């Protein structure tokens, strides 16, 4: 009859940008992370050192699971920034979960693998690594009583508006 | 960057998100839910409107 | 996983006025569901590709087209495509125009068809990608499952 079930579409991608470990002199780094997915972009603040900790979460509500999440680590310059490295995570590899995870350490690569003008991987590994978590969340369920209440309330309002 | 009108955090890809059937605020999956009526009608309701009517 | 099912949701064509429609398409196979975003007009174009991991073939792909409202979104038509019927190919196709029906038919709380055609149509491409090989152990498992769909693994 009337259901509050949220169903099973995975639309909310959660990304936890944790920290990084760079190979080299710490005064050499003032870095931020950019995330790009389904033409949405988000960025951490810039943090100094060879072991920056951002511990920042980002959420993206999307509908195209066929692509990937591009992650870039950038060294900040007063005039231009320079990429430290990148990874590309196909969205189909990302777990469905309701909880934050520990993340995994990924080696940062220097360059995108491009096919047909679209990124499809990365190549040329660096000695740098990033600690990153990502998961999809499921939609919420509304309890049956509360769903029935809302359906009736807004059916009555719809009926009134139509008149 | 359109962003959820409830949590002000989740960013929407183009055309994503749902508008609350009551207050019309656009919300992300953490911030409201769906009520389905028979197999042909669905509505959407944000968690602020839910709280109000509790 | 016997096969990857590719589903291209291309466009639709609604009977009646352009301004009446602002529609999205949802797909469901087993418990996996997907959706397009909403696009306005009598001939919206989504051009969105979906993929599903398929392990059983006796069921179907449920396709629904929904029209946005201020309060309620309304399901304007549906088709149910038995999986056993879908073409087996790696090649993307132009799609076929399918007439949308008004409602699902159920057997034991579960869709087994649709009824009551509408004057609205959807353009969908669907195909099963060819697996690379089928290990001897799995071939025995699939042979049993297929042999109750009057089917059998291609000898080649
Ligand atoms: Zn939100
Ligand atoms: Zn609301």
Numbering used by the authors:
A (entry chain A): -8 to 154
B (entry chain C): 89 to 142
C (entry chain B): 0 to 155
Reproduce passages from the article.
The Munc13–1/α-RIM interaction is particularly interesting in this regard since its physiological importance has been demonstrated and both Munc13–1 and α-RIMs are involved in priming and plasticity. Our results suggest that a Munc13–1 homodimer–Munc13–1/α-RIM heterodimer switch regulates neurotransmitter release and some forms of presynaptic plasticity, and reveal the structural basis for homo- and heterodimerization. 2A domain can in fact establish two different types of interactions that lead to either homodimerization with itself or heterodimerization with the RIM2α ZF domain. Since the Munc13–1/α-RIM interaction competes with Munc13–1 homodimerization, this model predicts that Munc13–1 may exist in solution as a homodimer that needs to be disrupted in order to bind to α-RIMs at the active zone.
2A-domain homodimer at 1.44 Å resolution, designed a mutation that disrupts homodimerization, and solved the X-ray crystal structure at 1.78 Å resolution of a Munc13–1 fragment bearing this mutation bound to the RIM2α ZF domain. The X-ray structure of the Munc13–1/RIM2α heterodimer described here provides the first high-resolution view of a complex directly involving a member from the family of ZF domains that includes α-RIMs and other Rab effectors. 2A domain and the α-helix with opposite sites of the ZF domain. 2A domain and the C-terminal α-helix exhibit an overt shape complementarity. 2A domain and C-terminal α-helix packs well against the ZF domain. 2A domain arising from the expression vector used also extends across to make contacts with strand 3 of the ZF-domain, but otherwise is not well packed against it. 82–142 observed in the crystals is consistent with all available data obtained in solution, whereas that involving monomer B is not. Thus, NMR studies showed that a long α-helix (helix a1) and an SGAWFY motif at the end of the short α-helix at the C-terminus of the RIM2α ZF domain (helix a2) bind to Rab3A, and that the interaction involving the SGAWFY motif is released upon binding of Munc13–1 to the ZF domain. 2A domain would have steric clashes with Rab3A upon binding to RIM2α. An emerging theme from these observations is that, because of their small size, ZF domains may often use multiple surfaces to increase the affinity and specificity of interactions with target proteins, although further research will be necessary to assess the generality of this notion.
